[PDB]
Amino acid sequence: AAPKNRRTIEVNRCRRRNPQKLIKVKNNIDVCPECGHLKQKHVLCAYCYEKVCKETAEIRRQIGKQEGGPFKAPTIETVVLYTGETPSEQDQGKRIIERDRKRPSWFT
Amino acid sequence: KKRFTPPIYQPKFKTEKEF
Amino acid sequence: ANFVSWKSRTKYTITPVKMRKSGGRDHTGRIRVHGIGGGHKQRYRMIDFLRFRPEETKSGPFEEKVIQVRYDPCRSADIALVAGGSRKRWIIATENMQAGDTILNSNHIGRMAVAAREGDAHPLGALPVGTLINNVESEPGRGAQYIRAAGTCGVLLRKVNGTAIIQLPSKRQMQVLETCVATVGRVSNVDHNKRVIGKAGRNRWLGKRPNSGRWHRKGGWAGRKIRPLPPMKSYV
RNA sequence: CCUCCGCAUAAGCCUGCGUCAGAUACUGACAAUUAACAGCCCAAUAUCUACAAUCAACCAACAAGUCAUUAUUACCCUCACUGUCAACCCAACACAGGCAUGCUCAUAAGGAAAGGUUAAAAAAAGUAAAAGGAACUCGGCAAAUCUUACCCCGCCUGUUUACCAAAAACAUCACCUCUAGCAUCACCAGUAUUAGAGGCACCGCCUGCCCAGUGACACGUUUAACGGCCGCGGUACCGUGCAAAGGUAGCAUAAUCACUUGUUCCUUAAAUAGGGACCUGUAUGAAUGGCUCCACGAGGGUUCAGCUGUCUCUUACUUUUAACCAGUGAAAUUGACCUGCCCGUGAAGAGGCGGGCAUAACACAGCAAGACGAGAAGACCCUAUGGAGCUUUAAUUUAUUAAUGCAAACACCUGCAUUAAAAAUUUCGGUUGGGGCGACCUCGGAGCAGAACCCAACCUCCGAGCAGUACAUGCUAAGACUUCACCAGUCAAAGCGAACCUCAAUUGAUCCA
RNA sequence: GCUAAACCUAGCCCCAAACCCCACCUUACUACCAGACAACCUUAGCCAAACCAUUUACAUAAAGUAUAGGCGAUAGAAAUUGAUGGCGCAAUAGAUAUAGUACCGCAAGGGAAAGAUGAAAAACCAAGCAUAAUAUAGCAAGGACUAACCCCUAUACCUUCUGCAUAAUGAAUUAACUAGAAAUAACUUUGCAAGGAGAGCCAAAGCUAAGACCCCCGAAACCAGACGAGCUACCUAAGAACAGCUAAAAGAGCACACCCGUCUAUGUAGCAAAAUAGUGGGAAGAUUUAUAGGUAGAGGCGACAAACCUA
Ligand SMILES: Nc1nc2c(ncn2[C@@H]2O[C@H](COP(=O)(O)OP(=O)(O)OP(=O)(O)O)[C@@H](O)[C@H]2O)c(=O)[nH]1
Ligand SMILES: [Mg+2]
Ligand SMILES: [Mg+2]
Ligand SMILES: [Mg+2]
Ligand SMILES: [Mg+2]
Ligand SMILES: [Mg+2]
Ligand SMILES: [Mg+2]
Ligand SMILES: [Mg+2]
Ligand SMILES: [Mg+2]
Ligand SMILES: [Mg+2]
Ligand SMILES: [Mg+2]
Ligand SMILES: [Mg+2]
Ligand SMILES: [Mg+2]
Ligand SMILES: [Mg+2]
Ligand SMILES: [Mg+2]
Ligand SMILES: [Mg+2]
Ligand SMILES: [Mg+2]
Ligand SMILES: [Mg+2]
Ligand SMILES: [Mg+2]
Ligand SMILES: [Mg+2]
Ligand SMILES: [Mg+2]
Ligand SMILES: [Mg+2]
Ligand SMILES: [Mg+2]
Ligand SMILES: [Mg+2]
Ligand SMILES: [Mg+2]
Ligand SMILES: [Mg+2]
Ligand SMILES: [Mg+2]
Ligand SMILES: [Mg+2]
Ligand SMILES: [Mg+2]
Ligand SMILES: [Mg+2]
Ligand SMILES: [Mg+2]
Ligand SMILES: [Mg+2]
Ligand SMILES: [Mg+2]
Ligand SMILES: [Mg+2]
Ligand SMILES: [Mg+2]
Ligand SMILES: [Mg+2]
Ligand SMILES: [Mg+2]
Ligand SMILES: [Mg+2]
Ligand SMILES: [Mg+2]
Ligand SMILES: [Zn+2]
């Protein structure tokens, strides 16, 4: 089947500017109390999540360096210790991942 | 008799143009 | 085209010569004869049809020994490697020609008739009337050209004047100078006529391409034609 | 998780995912592939070179085969040149296609079917399915199983319309007809058991009669050349006509004009199907080959049994597709459209016209009744003094070959004729209740057309294509008629010269003879 | 306000005048070995004759005359006479040309597009859209109206036809380009006038001069000369491939690779101008196939399918 006539710009404007086509305004956006960047209420904050992901990447790189190769996952719990921090009694018997920076305030 | 009209290729320069 | 005939060899030899098929194509490259093409590759064996060819520095009648009788791909009749003096040569083998046989080639026309013995070459004037001959020459010293296929045998009918009358296998009569040489007996491979091809593949092996599929109406030529035997072909 | 692969050589291409920097598998610059592998060879003159290969040994062959030097003379004294990359070539493309060889025969090498979500229809691929098991359908197509038997055609293996037909068509061994007595480019480095031009189609039984006609060959022959192969009167056989012979053997409702679904028996519950038969063919029939038959066939029919989603009768699920989100982003089409339904109208089937009815606005997903929907200036049919292909026993020719004969010259060549072969050029009228067939095509009389004239019809009816008489049926000339043009056809006063035409049609231009 | 719009000179057209280091024919652009091989030979056809067949054109004046000619379409003499730029184009124009380049084709061969500042860069306007989607009803307009619509009237255009809203053709739309050439004889207007005209020609008011009438695109075709057998048909040379099993020297069987393409489905602007998946035929031969060569259109080649000869 082929068009029998060219559809006019008036009809085309009707079709493509019908509110069903138009983008819907989102009212679920809100400010993150932690960093103040915008976030959707149900979604996690992009800025804070990126902070956590970068810290996780550093920790995981240290984990890989300590493991030294594939298939060397430890059989014990792991604890991340930052500069100026010593293992506690609970931390005893756990693999220590040392990070060469001050503990982040958000991290606890 | 079989009727076949060979396709006609438009010149390449028309579609090869660049800014 | 750039077609050059493979028949460029100038010196006679016993070695099989590497041939080149034509496929029925003329030197211009166009098909001149249909139904020829492909087939098993073959090597040509130079046949000395001038049976009385006395060796260099020699003359007169001479004998030769049959080393072997060999199938020839280029010929219906099988050939024989006949050796005499210090030379060998391929010749056309007669029916009852075995290895080790002695073959006499002479140019002498005696007053009487030589006792015909199969395989030997004598001038037609020296043969008894009615003897079976083959490899007959049109002219004295021309070389054998007639009665060369398998099982073909000419007949010596008359010897009037210094001429001989020969019944060719096609029954045509031929007058030739009695000095021209012809071998005694019939050509070998007499049963060649009773060869069954069996399959189209064997024809293709022999090198005969299939006939054209186009249907031809048969004209007035088609009907059986009974004609009087043509008159004698004379060469005197 | 996949692995068709993959790695090399060849061929092809020619720097085409190496580095750096800019942009936004691109641009510019820089770099690179190093010969041993491969290519690029050989001083002459003669002279040698029968004995395959196949583990080469037995064997068996046929289609009869890639693999060799010597003699003399020359001559050493001095390792260049070129390919080497890649994700690659031919297909307009990073194209599911094409693409030789050696190894790897599933991999050591090479790769990723899912952009994300949902799990609507319709669509594609696949799997499973109660009971039934072809009841579907043109047909067991497809799918599932592994499955019998009978026919037609063709013997068989092969070949063919690349891109709608793979066949029963073409070829084919076998058989047969015709032609040819011969060598230096095919046939053939051959010679009648050979070669070529053909027909038919292994084999088995056969291939009947005919040369009157045409053709061919001969100066009558020939049908395995084109082809043909009957009647009449009397009551199957008794006589006769005609013909060249009157269709023989065989088979037969055939793939065989129609009748046709021929008539029967078997087969089915039922059969225009299939198979077996017939006083079954005046349109069967014998190398335009006839019957029989072994094998074989993606050939065409029929069928037992099984099998199954073919179907009764559809359902469920997975993947793809799909819809939604993101990126990128065509195509035919399109007069403008503010683009409803019914009836009627009309260029003879209306969204637009008339009378009614209906009627806020726009999206999204489906559907295919219409827009005489898109697509290809319909391939069907007709027309065109438009083409082309092919065949001839269409018209015109023999320039060209081959023969002859006559000249010319002393067989060849040249010129002129004749005959064939091969061809070449060109055409294939019109009317027409569409075209074709049939009929007709010009002229006159009568109706249609009653009365000045004129009037069509493939409307109705009659006729003509002369005949007779005369030889002034001579010559001239006003004025008129006119078949609706012109051409042509008509009448005619007066005058000269003399005597003292009938007939409705009864015909035809120019040029040229 | 975006796409965009414009622009003036790059050049070209018609005339006049004037005559115009090395490598490379082998596989061209390849330093360096016995050759022998050498060119000349009527154009045809389309077309016109309304077909087609003989035939049909390739200074002035005599003259379109003598002649030729299916005496018709048409063809057509000779004697004789005397002989310095642009009322051009200006980037769809003018050369095809920025270039015979890019690109396309095996080859012969075909064949493009386009650029715009300034003295110095060492300084408002087409279509289409957006601003700004839409309100019942209808060739979209007109009469109107206070009022856009509502009311009433109105069957797009062109071509073709007896007759079209026609559900007959064309058209999406904008810009640019794109199609009436001329004699005879007349008519009008001048000049001169029994003469006119700047030899020739005409003339019983004619002659001389001027004005004013004759389109565009489209075939299948025909012929000539080139180019093509890297596809395909067949052939030539010298090569290569064919596992495994059954059988046994087989145009044998099953079956891979390989070749082919039976049937179904999908696809039908497709992955593909003939493919994919399944299924299937052959697969030691009349097999398949790599390389090079050959046969060329009045032809080749053909196990004739009027097959194939660069879709
Ligand atoms: N009609 C015309 N006149 C030209 C043409 N070329 C040059 N001329 C004329 O030639 C004359 C001389 O030209 P110039 O260039 O001044 O001089 P020139 O170079 O000596 O001239 P030529 O000798 O003609 O080359 C002038 O009158 C030009 O108009 C041309 O093509 N056509
Ligand atoms: Mg035949
Ligand atoms: Mg993927
Ligand atoms: Mg997806
Ligand atoms: Mg079931
Ligand atoms: Mg049924
Ligand atoms: Mg059944
Ligand atoms: Mg039914
Ligand atoms: Mg099936
Ligand atoms: Mg067959
Ligand atoms: Mg077969
Ligand atoms: Mg073939
Ligand atoms: Mg086909
Ligand atoms: Mg084929
Ligand atoms: Mg097919
Ligand atoms: Mg056949
Ligand atoms: Mg049935
Ligand atoms: Mg999207
Ligand atoms: Mg209606
Ligand atoms: Mg919709
Ligand atoms: Mg329709
Ligand atoms: Mg349509
Ligand atoms: Mg038409
Ligand atoms: Mg015509
Ligand atoms: Mg009149
Ligand atoms: Mg004409
Ligand atoms: Mg005309
Ligand atoms: Mg003159
Ligand atoms: Mg231009
Ligand atoms: Mg605008
Ligand atoms: Mg309409
Ligand atoms: Mg219309
Ligand atoms: Mg029309
Ligand atoms: Mg249209
Ligand atoms: Mg080739
Ligand atoms: Mg094998
Ligand atoms: Mg086999
Ligand atoms: Mg045929
Ligand atoms: Mg045909
Ligand atoms: Zn945050």
mmCIF file of C-alpha atoms (C1' of nucleotides) in Angstrom, chain D residues 353-490:
data_model
loop_
_atom_site.group_PDB
_atom_site.id
_atom_site.type_symbol
_atom_site.label_atom_id
_atom_site.label_comp_id
_atom_site.label_asym_id
_atom_site.label_seq_id
_atom_site.Cartn_x
_atom_site.Cartn_y
_atom_site.Cartn_z
ATOM 1 C "C1'" C D 353 -23.458 15.935 -7.414
ATOM 2 C "C1'" G D 354 -29.474 15.946 -5.536
ATOM 3 C "C1'" G D 355 -32.637 14.283 -1.128
ATOM 4 C "C1'" G D 356 -31.884 12.419 3.587
ATOM 5 C "C1'" C D 357 -28.964 10.848 7.940
ATOM 6 C "C1'" A D 358 -24.614 11.497 10.918
ATOM 7 C "C1'" U D 359 -21.064 14.806 12.823
ATOM 8 C "C1'" A D 360 -16.223 18.448 19.199
ATOM 9 C "C1'" A D 361 -10.962 17.690 18.694
ATOM 10 C "C1'" C D 362 -7.118 15.124 17.755
ATOM 11 C "C1'" A D 363 -3.387 10.236 19.019
ATOM 12 C "C1'" C D 364 -1.742 4.809 19.419
ATOM 13 C "C1'" A D 365 -2.486 -0.589 17.886
ATOM 14 C "C1'" G D 366 -4.984 -3.803 14.405
ATOM 15 C "C1'" C D 367 -7.968 -4.978 9.624
ATOM 16 C "C1'" A D 368 -7.964 -5.226 4.554
ATOM 17 C "C1'" A D 369 -14.339 -3.899 2.145
ATOM 18 C "C1'" G D 370 -13.231 0.786 -0.908
ATOM 19 C "C1'" A D 371 -10.102 4.980 -2.508
ATOM 20 C "C1'" C D 372 -12.160 1.457 -10.005
ATOM 21 C "C1'" G D 373 -5.460 1.388 -4.281
ATOM 22 C "C1'" A D 374 0.741 1.374 -5.644
ATOM 23 C "C1'" G D 375 3.611 -0.982 -9.368
ATOM 24 C "C1'" A D 376 5.023 -1.450 -14.588
ATOM 25 C "C1'" A D 377 2.434 4.337 -21.444
ATOM 26 C "C1'" G D 378 -1.811 -4.156 -20.730
ATOM 27 C "C1'" A D 379 2.219 -9.152 -22.798
ATOM 28 C "C1'" C D 380 -4.890 -10.479 -24.054
ATOM 29 C "C1'" C D 381 -7.659 -8.214 -28.545
ATOM 30 C "C1'" C D 382 -7.700 -4.636 -32.642
ATOM 31 C "C1'" U D 383 -5.300 -0.762 -35.546
ATOM 32 C "C1'" A D 384 -0.416 1.318 -37.969
ATOM 33 C "C1'" U D 385 0.239 1.377 -45.890
ATOM 34 C "C1'" G D 386 5.056 0.551 -37.638
ATOM 35 C "C1'" G D 387 8.826 -3.559 -36.822
ATOM 36 C "C1'" A D 388 11.496 -7.861 -36.468
ATOM 37 C "C1'" G D 389 12.278 -13.645 -36.184
ATOM 38 C "C1'" C D 390 11.260 -17.967 -38.999
ATOM 39 C "C1'" U D 391 9.274 -20.864 -43.466
ATOM 40 C "C1'" U D 392 8.377 -21.088 -48.239
ATOM 41 C "C1'" U D 393 5.637 -23.698 -53.582
ATOM 42 C "C1'" A D 394 5.238 -14.969 -52.148
ATOM 43 C "C1'" A D 395 7.724 -10.905 -55.894
ATOM 44 C "C1'" U D 396 12.643 -9.538 -57.563
ATOM 45 C "C1'" U D 397 17.783 -10.985 -58.394
ATOM 46 C "C1'" U D 398 22.470 -14.305 -58.931
ATOM 47 C "C1'" A D 399 26.311 -9.669 -57.106
ATOM 48 C "C1'" U D 400 28.671 -14.625 -54.541
ATOM 49 C "C1'" U D 401 30.216 -19.881 -54.811
ATOM 50 C "C1'" A D 402 29.907 -24.731 -57.603
ATOM 51 C "C1'" A D 403 29.557 -26.720 -62.071
ATOM 52 C "C1'" U D 404 29.215 -26.866 -67.169
ATOM 53 C "C1'" G D 405 29.150 -24.537 -72.640
ATOM 54 C "C1'" C D 406 31.215 -20.635 -75.657
ATOM 55 C "C1'" A D 407 35.026 -17.372 -76.405
ATOM 56 C "C1'" A D 408 40.188 -15.743 -74.745
ATOM 57 C "C1'" A D 409 44.955 -18.077 -74.167
ATOM 58 C "C1'" C D 410 47.727 -21.802 -75.707
ATOM 59 C "C1'" A D 411 45.052 -27.326 -66.608
ATOM 60 C "C1'" C D 412 44.845 -22.258 -64.372
ATOM 61 C "C1'" C D 413 43.188 -17.046 -65.126
ATOM 62 C "C1'" U D 414 39.740 -13.546 -67.596
ATOM 63 C "C1'" G D 415 34.839 -12.263 -70.171
ATOM 64 C "C1'" C D 416 30.008 -13.874 -71.583
ATOM 65 C "C1'" A D 417 25.894 -17.067 -70.947
ATOM 66 C "C1'" U D 418 22.948 -21.480 -68.700
ATOM 67 C "C1'" U D 419 21.824 -24.494 -64.483
ATOM 68 C "C1'" A D 420 21.866 -25.415 -59.248
ATOM 69 C "C1'" A D 421 23.413 -24.320 -54.258
ATOM 70 C "C1'" A D 422 23.216 -20.953 -50.980
ATOM 71 C "C1'" A D 423 21.510 -16.725 -49.864
ATOM 72 C "C1'" A D 424 19.998 -11.172 -50.149
ATOM 73 C "C1'" U D 425 15.878 -7.127 -50.419
ATOM 74 C "C1'" U D 426 10.800 -6.421 -49.746
ATOM 75 C "C1'" U D 427 5.585 -7.299 -48.975
ATOM 76 C "C1'" C D 428 1.861 -9.780 -46.948
ATOM 77 C "C1'" G D 429 -5.047 -4.904 -49.656
ATOM 78 C "C1'" G D 430 -9.456 -2.716 -47.681
ATOM 79 C "C1'" U D 431 -14.813 -2.882 -45.939
ATOM 80 C "C1'" U D 432 -16.245 -5.467 -41.605
ATOM 81 C "C1'" G D 433 -22.043 -4.526 -35.287
ATOM 82 C "C1'" G D 434 -14.383 -6.158 -32.433
ATOM 83 C "C1'" G D 435 -10.884 -9.254 -35.406
ATOM 84 C "C1'" G D 436 -11.125 -13.971 -38.165
ATOM 85 C "C1'" C D 437 -14.187 -17.079 -41.705
ATOM 86 C "C1'" G D 438 -17.762 -16.218 -45.251
ATOM 87 C "C1'" A D 439 -19.372 -12.297 -48.668
ATOM 88 C "C1'" C D 440 -18.181 -7.878 -51.121
ATOM 89 C "C1'" C D 441 -15.023 -3.897 -53.886
ATOM 90 C "C1'" U D 442 -16.620 -1.003 -60.752
ATOM 91 C "C1'" C D 443 -21.337 0.417 -63.697
ATOM 92 C "C1'" G D 444 -26.894 0.761 -64.589
ATOM 93 C "C1'" G D 445 -32.580 0.284 -63.343
ATOM 94 C "C1'" A D 446 -36.623 0.024 -59.162
ATOM 95 C "C1'" G D 447 -38.075 0.797 -53.937
ATOM 96 C "C1'" C D 448 -36.279 2.720 -49.033
ATOM 97 C "C1'" A D 449 -36.314 8.248 -51.038
ATOM 98 C "C1'" G D 450 -45.033 8.878 -52.880
ATOM 99 C "C1'" A D 451 -44.267 15.415 -55.168
ATOM 100 C "C1'" A D 452 -37.359 20.079 -57.900
ATOM 101 C "C1'" C D 453 -32.543 17.794 -56.845
ATOM 102 C "C1'" C D 454 -29.666 14.900 -53.386
ATOM 103 C "C1'" C D 455 -29.546 10.814 -49.769
ATOM 104 C "C1'" A D 456 -27.083 5.265 -45.954
ATOM 105 C "C1'" A D 457 -27.058 0.393 -44.997
ATOM 106 C "C1'" C D 458 -22.648 -6.872 -44.572
ATOM 107 C "C1'" C D 459 -30.821 -3.182 -46.563
ATOM 108 C "C1'" U D 460 -34.684 -5.311 -50.418
ATOM 109 C "C1'" C D 461 -34.814 -6.862 -55.767
ATOM 110 C "C1'" C D 462 -33.189 -6.896 -60.754
ATOM 111 C "C1'" G D 463 -29.355 -6.685 -64.189
ATOM 112 C "C1'" A D 464 -23.829 -5.034 -67.236
ATOM 113 C "C1'" G D 465 -18.627 -6.117 -68.540
ATOM 114 C "C1'" C D 466 -22.404 -6.815 -74.966
ATOM 115 C "C1'" A D 467 -24.916 -7.229 -79.262
ATOM 116 C "C1'" G D 468 -26.996 -5.315 -83.682
ATOM 117 C "C1'" U D 469 -27.141 -1.765 -87.804
ATOM 118 C "C1'" A D 470 -24.340 1.439 -90.374
ATOM 119 C "C1'" C D 471 -20.014 3.059 -92.889
ATOM 120 C "C1'" A D 472 -20.835 11.380 -93.375
ATOM 121 C "C1'" U D 473 -21.330 6.042 -87.038
ATOM 122 C "C1'" G D 474 -17.713 13.103 -91.230
ATOM 123 C "C1'" C D 475 -15.798 18.234 -89.926
ATOM 124 C "C1'" U D 476 -16.901 22.256 -87.150
ATOM 125 C "C1'" A D 477 -19.559 25.384 -83.568
ATOM 126 C "C1'" A D 478 -23.319 29.114 -80.070
ATOM 127 C "C1'" G D 479 -25.414 27.702 -75.574
ATOM 128 C "C1'" A D 480 -26.292 24.460 -71.730
ATOM 129 C "C1'" C D 481 -26.358 19.733 -68.305
ATOM 130 C "C1'" U D 482 -23.121 17.150 -64.939
ATOM 131 C "C1'" U D 483 -23.643 11.717 -60.464
ATOM 132 C "C1'" C D 484 -22.701 16.721 -55.242
ATOM 133 C "C1'" A D 485 -14.781 18.286 -55.891
ATOM 134 C "C1'" C D 486 -11.419 17.201 -59.921
ATOM 135 C "C1'" C D 487 -10.774 13.525 -63.546
ATOM 136 C "C1'" A D 488 -14.420 11.822 -66.474
ATOM 137 C "C1'" G D 489 -19.250 11.896 -68.621
ATOM 138 C "C1'" U D 490 -23.660 14.263 -71.254
#
